[model samples]
Target: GMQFDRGYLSPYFINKPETGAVELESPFILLADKKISNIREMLPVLEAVAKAGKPLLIIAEDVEGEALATLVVNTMRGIVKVAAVKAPGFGDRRKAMLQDIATLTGGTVISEEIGMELEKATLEDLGQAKRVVINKDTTTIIDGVGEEAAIQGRVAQIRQQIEEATSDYDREKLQERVAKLAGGV
Candidate 1:
């Protein structure tokens, strides 16, 4: 609804990336409506992973800058877990958005402090402990602003993989799969 980069007001989009996390404005959650512009972006990647069967993990940034606006994206994607990663500026208010993601997925919002490994941090490191490597593979879950695939069947396969892969994802088996999966081709 609000104009941004394409319009040069990127500051606005950046500050409210997931608009859903915002108050008075039209939050990014509106993307959930199914009537936006793009959808094919995620179809192919999501299809491949769904067929393969794997869990999807998302990382958010700049909430005080515009990331909460991006979190609203979950509302449209259907089933998604929000992991809140805290930053220095957002103060205590942003924690609510992070908590919301944890609430939706039954997961926790991990502060960058506990063990995010920022400067030395590489995408490779996030799911590394679980070895559930995240890469171009799982990204299919949400390609861009708007996208989907006829992936229900494939998603079922991924669910089975999830069911069989981790005895408790809070363990190493997950890291093992992540390595095998995100290790890439």
Candidate 2:
């Protein structure tokens, strides 16, 4: 289990942050490299996840406009249990972090560069975890379903990056990633 210093994109997305936080059990995770706004592109997956009877954790560059409104409405109306969070970092670093999340969650990153579209995404493309806790400014993923060997491979890859990194700041950031993947606080 690890904590990500990112929060729900909307206050209405959860019941109330002051009462602790939103805790999802065995939620399906969606990792997208782009912002989500169009409700049309998101409806299918939302419906599918609803049918599956599990909560959903949407990690994207951003979720706003119609898409954000719909998610909040659905959650409030008890239609689908869902929450959205902005993907951490910016530009290339953001992409790298998204990949790290995908690796940790056993999910595929939905990127247009890879010809993946949100409209075509199904439940199989999502990731799963034993639990997820979302607060005003933090999210914790507990016991991800990711394979242990694959996580170790990702940690090794990050360690290599740390060794090759020349900038102190870059190296420090890389080490933080390694620590998270290796289950260090």
Candidate 3:
């Protein structure tokens, strides 16, 4: 995925409101196959991430057509970030590369396996990431920023919610979520 053009891998920085300030929750990446010819094609994808208050990182296999180029350039306007790589096509190895992108950036890779089409992307289609860095030689991301501590914080907060919940059902659900985040009950 590194051979296309070093031009595609140029070092870039994104200044999302929460970037570098706090660990982002549920950061995700989606791979784009065809040229996105218009902003209309990009709206649902952008709007979904924005609505969830999550930033999205895209690993587009090809980013050449006029519309795609514009899409990449205008990423700053929405809850989106992009990396144009010469990734392999859909297949087993393609799955690994998607996973690798998610791992490096602490983000999840959107899989095409379940008929997950980029053309019709959604919030459910997004993944999570901690940090992302796109340098000259490569594009990479580091997963799990403040992960354990974040979990512990959530556990503490959930404990307070448990105390506040008026219903057993709500309390139990919150407790369960906390337990999972805490790595156990």
Candidate 4:
């Protein structure tokens, strides 16, 4: 497979009511304008966590749209991993998503700032990886939808990358913690 820029003009997002995900089937395109530029079209693969049943925590600053992100999650919904977006602005749709990120995909939304050492966070930083254990947090996601898009086919790819990049083994522990917290959401 390959990564194509599912730009702002993609039809994935419903234009009218009754043509999109339940959450977006409202008067307005609640979850409209989606893009799948980097993720696979049919989902190359999806994996499940056992001990924690949590997803790996991956952070990115280049993600462009919530629809794009949502599409990415939906495409990989069968898989598990919490992706934290370093979104700069607060769009109406994206803001709503932020409130329900964990519930939507069993993931977490990390905001403010996460440095190259993504795993390293101040006590103030509430967001961190859980399922796919990793220590250091920087792997430069520069692959266009192709190179890295299919790259995530196997959760092991991302998980291994994270483990290779970091020194943490609490991914399972984090998953348990999230499972317990997910109940409240």
Candidate 5:
């Protein structure tokens, strides 16, 4: 068995307070770029996850409208165990941070630019973790299932950017990213 380092990710990302906090064991993580609003496009993935009998963790730009209502109802009814959080960062940086999460969790970023449709996303497209604690303003991932090599590669890539960064603020942010990936908060 492999051991993974636990990491804390805070204020940079957050869960909807109305949905409440969630604690999950061995949950599936879905990293998506767009807001989740269409129930028709989301139900398929939700059903598949329900069938798999595992909790699902959704990280998206925003989980609102019909999608949020449906998730809350399903959760209240115990139909599917799930928690959704807003993805961290903004614009280009947000995309990069999402990719960071993908690499950390061994999941793919569902982006339209990449032609990945959320409707067609299956369980295999999601990531796995030993545990995840999502609060109104924090998320802690323990023992992610990502390959060691891939995680290391991503850390190295960020390090390279840190060195190339011209501004102190950018360098600091890059350093923070590296710390989150390698040092566990």
Candidate 6:
């Protein structure tokens, strides 16, 4: 089912930037949890991601009111990003799959056991993706933090375009759609 896309290939040195890799202070990872349905339920995951000091790509099912408010606050601070995907349909099987993928990519999936490992992890627990691109229909995440700076520039164009729009409401909707696209959700 996994078809190779030649279009997805980007050679490392082809057009590499000269400056420091486009980094956001630190590396981040994609985290998902189906067990979290409320603020209290969501806290463990958020705490772990913050403690890890990395941006998050969270796939949470239901986060309402105070939980959502708090989520927005953190995301605005560039601490995390939550994708509004439905709860995991595969249950524990889903969790296991994510756990494996996170490990393979050098990231950790926030789980009950990991929630307690602060001192041991606060140093360097984030998985560094080479670069991630969220397009109209897909999100491409390549594993290697060094080359990410290059792609960061392209997203800026979308940011500038959104900023130049005239109507507030129109722009708001436009931005939400674009942000969703950027999130690939």
Q: Which candidate is the best by lDDT?
A: 2
lDDT of 2 by residue, 1-185 (tens): 86778898877777655665788999999989998998899988888898999999999989999999988988889877999999888888888877777788888888767567888898988888898888889888888888888889999999998899999999999988877778921
> All predictions: root-mean-square deviation over Cα?
17.6, 1.7, 13.8, 18.1, 5.3, 16.1
lDDT of predicted model 1? 0.28
Q: How would you order the candidates by TM-score, starting with the best?
A: 2, 5, 3, 6, 1, 4
lDDT of 2 at 20: 54
Clashing pairs in 5: none
For model 3, residues 1-185, the per-residue Cα lDDT tens digits are: 11111223323333432432112234555555443446666677777777776665556555456645565566535435544444443555445444433333333444444665665776655545555444334444445333445446556766887999999987876665554345421
C-alpha displacement of 47 in model 1, angstroms?
16
Query: What range of 10 consecutive residues in model 3 has the weakest lDDT sum?
Result: 1-10
RMSD of 3: 13.8
lDDT of 4 by residue, 1-185 (tens): 11111222223322223532211100100111122234432122112221223332222334345634665555355433333223212354243333232222322343333441223322122222211111122111111112222223323333444455544554553333333223222
After superposition, candidate 1 runs with Cα above 4 Å error: 1-59, 63-89, 115-185
User: Which model is ahead, 2 or 5, in terms of TM-score?
Assistant: 2
Alpha carbon lDDT at 129, candidate 2: 89
TM-score of 4: 0.20
Q: What TM-score goes with each of the models?
A: 0.22, 0.94, 0.49, 0.20, 0.86, 0.40
Name the lDDT value of residue 141 in candidate 6: 45
